[PDB]
Write a structure and sequence with these properties.
The structure is a homotetramer. By secondary structure, chain A is of the alpha+beta class. Chain A has one domain. The first copy, chain A, has helices spanning 2-10, 15-34, 39-53, 115-126, 133-142, 146-153, 184-190, 194-203, 206-210, 212-225, 266-274, 282-297, 329-342, 346-359, and strands spanning 80-87, 91-97, 164-170, 176-182, 239-246, 255-261, 302-308, 319-323, 372-380, 384-391. In chain A, 53% of the residues are buried. Chains A and B meet through α4 and α5 of A and α4 and α5 of B. The PDB classes it as transferase.
Chain lengths: 398, 397, 397, 398
């Protein structure tokens, strides 16, 4: 098995990296197999993970070892998540993490401000298509200096001492990095409405100055969000909580504005999905029906993620993220099978439970309530409907 | 002794680091002593230099070893210079370098795009006042992706395959980093006038949007520069070739726009110094006299305009004279004469002996390489100041 | 100041290193000052400590963080002690530690078998006089393979999962390393009497084969020890529990055989001190008086016999009294009284104030942990000497 | 292809490691394929090579970069060799190298005294069967201090500034390390006959003191060597130039005494092979015939390597190493095919030339004279005849 062969060939520079491997790499090999990645790509991505991601994961939080930095990415405070994106034709795998610097959560680096950029730098030398210019732009506009990071830690719970996190799409051979920057620490430290600091940063992008369509699609999103998110500096929902970019050519990168909210019901789903009645086409409404039905078939906030691309003036429906923490995972798996049937993805319906068990062989998933963390649903004009399932891999292994 | 004591205590991770120490650290300790730094600051800066700078300097270019990356900072291609800033009351030391990444000058990193930031990151964890937000801003607006870097290396000589360089001011007990971003690679690759890509980047800064006085000073500067630098995408001097920032709180950082040109004569000096007749005060003119006299007593010339948030009015630039190719004994004689003109008699009396002490392995009467630049400035607050830049490796062999 | 200056200049690669500095380096600078080391040696040793020792110390055991490897060197399980060696004329400082590998105490490295050698290797490139041949010799003869290590951890408490430990004498301007190899793990795992595996290892040394006097001194020692330590494979005290060497030129290295025992009384002290009546001279007896008086004025006891190539005659051992569990204010009162007995009046006058200065964060009148060992020795050449070992972390919290 | 996939997944920490990969890893993948290693073992050994061996190879000597340390392992001064061991039933691959420390060939480490041990330490944490006790023993007895290493560099050519080298047998899944220690530097510095310093070190081994059979087989080898190698301190052939051990349990490790000599002819081959007429059995004579015929079918010295094992009192025939540097490689390949025919290994005969070309796709091997470096031949009582072919991999690639 590739995950075992790599463990035998490579070993580990320290015990925390060994623990990370023993609690994630079998699941990851299983995910990749299940997505129909060849043996050669299983080796490619597992080798990549060993080299680049293990040292980025910091100490492995366990009984008797409590790290200085606790991530909000998972239930046990581990800075890792693995997800699958399922559409009509294929399934791809994504890793999500926070790259932990070795002074993270101490006075020299209170919000873990360096590690993700250091990982990205290493990815830029590894991969020709990786471009750090958007990272740097948003790191400049929403990052904080050390004294501001210290202030921010006095206003935030320990699991939200973060400014950025990273996702790596493992798309048929390649690694595509994306990042999300949090707006809340700067909002809190500077007492600036989140809406305002989010669009001020976006509107300073070079590509925004160059690209009329991007500007127009943003102007439409702002008209939608302005009356719905706070106008004052409050941290109350719905709120613009993250800005996302792809770490590629900025002319090709999708810019994402992610809203966090607790309140959701069928009419709110319509509101977010259609942008308050702005989108009325057959495609949009067909996706709306899908999402309504997912919500029927089925604590962290809901997520609503609006994505825009240079060259496109019109907004598309967001991706909607359902929070599944606290909800029994056997129930989630029953719901998913039912939903996959509704979609007519019969193969997915027939495999989901067996594949789930196989992904997590050392825990009885029927008894957990923290292994499924999120379910994202999206509908594309061109590419079809898509579903993104996010797992707390360490919850599924310990 | 502090340089030797640190060498004995610490040793070296590899031979290139040992060669860098053996060819720079004695001079550096000498510079620090001569600026009246206490023994405790000598250990401070030298320990700092050993830990942070030696690994950033890359391979030590020498007979038989030709690095993949060659720096234009020095005559032998070594990415290092040491300078002193002399004013009425004190002398401070500064290090200038390019932090070399381990894949610099290869297909994975053609313009050495990563090393300086990696060094700055480690400084940010070392030093509470170090703020990387202005770095990241300009790296975003003037940096290039890998394919663009590769294109840029086909249009530029080996010694200009750079996007950024770093200075570290060793000022009282602190280290203050500054960086300069080059505009030429992005100008060449994108065919964008250097003037436009420079002010477009500056005008996207958050502090520019927040600060009315800064926006006023910049409009004055753009009025001055627009008719003087190219309006098309040519790399035709005079031109806006670097943007500089201090890696501190952006409300306190000085923004610098640096012009490069190969023509200088009295009429041009006056034009640059006074901003085309805008500055006419007794201060400005007392400085202009200095500069004219320096040029008489005596690589492109440099002209560096500096702006600070909160200040609407422009000051005279710093002007940089290239000294490469000119005998260093002559330079030292000229400087002694100039220091006499200034009435800095102490400096005049010490300069030649302190120079010899800085560089014991060379004889300055025979080199033309060791003095590389002379910067002269004047400000109303602080007085006249002079910056002398040395090729430390040239002075040591 | 030197400890603070180095902290400002260097910072820290990770938080465990920063915690080690914050809990040891001020005391260490205090010890060095008190031994009259010049400022330049203070920077020397402290810079050395920062670079070589901090990364060797592993994670800093603290509430919420429990390392996979726990050292028996200190009460809290930290692999560090600092000691002073006081004689008539001078006081020198020494560091004792276990260099922790990153997989120490896990299946890949159960007895921490690699870290000390890795540190010694880096010292050998740092220091021309450091010679690893005696290390490698004893590591070969008393070290264990992985399966044997795993067996040994099933037979030994967590705090005795070790094969070697290292001392660094900070003597004049140099660093002199020494190591001690434990015989017990190989004794337990192979069921070989400790006496036999100790002398078998020693008798295979090249210097033993080359040097007649050494072979004579060792035969005398074996005669003394054979009837006193176990002839079977028991771990029954008194026993030969460590072999020590200096990591220098094997012709100059002192070989040490260390006995551990839990019984001591006047008749045993005399028996160990005089080698069962072999040494009867005025020197030996003046030392025995010292030792008896120290025991009166006041973990196994230790008895350390030292031999040198070129010397056929045995000297009195160094005797180590365990002080764990005994009030440190009392210990300090006892030492002042003892130093008076010795006529070292300066030491008597400074001891309690210098102690307080070494450990400002604790109150010694209330701790029982800070003094860990007292070693006493006498030699005809050099006089009496006393070695006091402190749990530096206990003294700092 | 595994070597390419690993290059894509992993990249390189510096340019010298990248150059090492680009000039060795394709050949290595090709060797492993040709030895019938599965895809999973190709990944295992290539991943191992990337992690452990690349950083050990030091700077890649090339036009414009002349390292401080030059290895005598290859023609261009590169510290690497790859070999194949061919017997009746199978072929296995071995790597040979010198692990270069970062101060090697400078005043702080004149004979590269540290790097091999540092690599071995890392192998001991990677692999449970690795045992460093013999390494340490011989490092103690024949190693030199820094002042002695400096003296030795004044008496030795630059390519012989070495005290140890390492071989890694890639035997069906496992890595088995062996080392060879040079006796010449200590011989030169101390003015001690090589014979005497070699057997003095061996006779201090713990296993020698414990094992009557080992002692007896050594006593027989010494009776053979004493009248044939120098009695004074001269460095003249035949001489005992290396001591080899396996870095495993010392009760299982074969101890090797390697002789270097320039003069060889059929009667010398008999002398070495039979230990001066001591070995007269049918097996020995059948192997002698083989070796005579190899010599007929067919500058560095010849090697004669006597191997002994605890528990065995009787000596076996040595392995005899023919130096092939300077000899056209197309000629060597013709000779090998002819020899393989003589042996009746017809498959090897039919493949050798095509496989050779395929191992070295970027150089025309018919035109080189430095790619084959050594040919070792051995005959085993139990395991049969064996042939070891050593290649200068960098010579075959640049």
């Amino acid at each position: 098995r590739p995950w075992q062969i790599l463990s035998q060939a490579l070993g580990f520079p320290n015990y925390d990296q060994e623990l990370w491997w023993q609690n994630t790499a079998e699941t990851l090999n299983r995910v990749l197999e299940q997505c129909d990645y060849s043996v050669h790509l299983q080796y490619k991505y597992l080798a990549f993970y060993h080299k680049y991601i293990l040292p980025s994961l910091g100490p492995f939080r366990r009984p008797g070892v409590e790290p200085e930095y606790i991530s909000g990415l998972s239930h046990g405070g581990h800075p890792l998540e693995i997800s699958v994106k399922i559409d009509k034709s294929k399934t791809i795998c994504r890793l999500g993490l926070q790259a932990i610097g070795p002074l993270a959560g101490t006075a020299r680096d209170p919000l873990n401000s360096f590690g993700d950029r250091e990982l990205l730098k290493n990815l830029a030398t590894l991969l020709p298509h990786v471009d750090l210019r958007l990272f740097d732009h948003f790191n400049a506009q929403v990052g904080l200096d050390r004294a501001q990071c210290a202030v921010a830690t006095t206003k935030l719970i320990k699991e939200s001492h973060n400014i950025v996190c990273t996702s790596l799409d493992l798309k048929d051979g390649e690694v595509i990095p994306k990042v999300y920057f949090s707006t809340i620490p700067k909002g809190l430290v500077t007492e600036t409405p989140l809406f305002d600091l989010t669009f001020a940063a976006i509107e300073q992008m070079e590509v925004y100055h160059k690209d009329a369509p991007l500007r127009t699609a943003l102007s439409s999103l702002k008209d939608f969000l302005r009356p719905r998110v706070p106008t004052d500096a409050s941290i109350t929902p719905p709120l613009t909580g993250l800005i996302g970019v792809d770490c590629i050519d900025p002319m090709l990168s999708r810019l994402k504005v992610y809203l966090a909210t607790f309140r959701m019901d069928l009419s709110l789903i319509r509101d977010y999905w259609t942008l308050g009645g702005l989108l009325t086409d057959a495609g949009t409404m067909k996706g709306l029906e899908m999402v309504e039905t997912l919500a029927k078939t089925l604590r962290l906030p809901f997520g609503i993620n609006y994505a825009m691309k240079p060259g496109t003036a019109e907004l598309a429906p967001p991706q909607i993220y359902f929070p599944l923490l606290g909800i029994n995972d056997g129930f989630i798996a029953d719901a998913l099978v039912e939903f996959f049937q509704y979609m007519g993805w019969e193969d997915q319906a027939n495999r989901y439970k067996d594949e789930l068990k196989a992904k997590f062989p050392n825990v009885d998933i029927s008894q957990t309530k923290n292994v499924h963390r999120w379910l994202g649903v999206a509908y594309s004009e061109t590419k079809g409907p898509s579903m993104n399932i996010y797992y707390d891999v360490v919850a599924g292994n310990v």
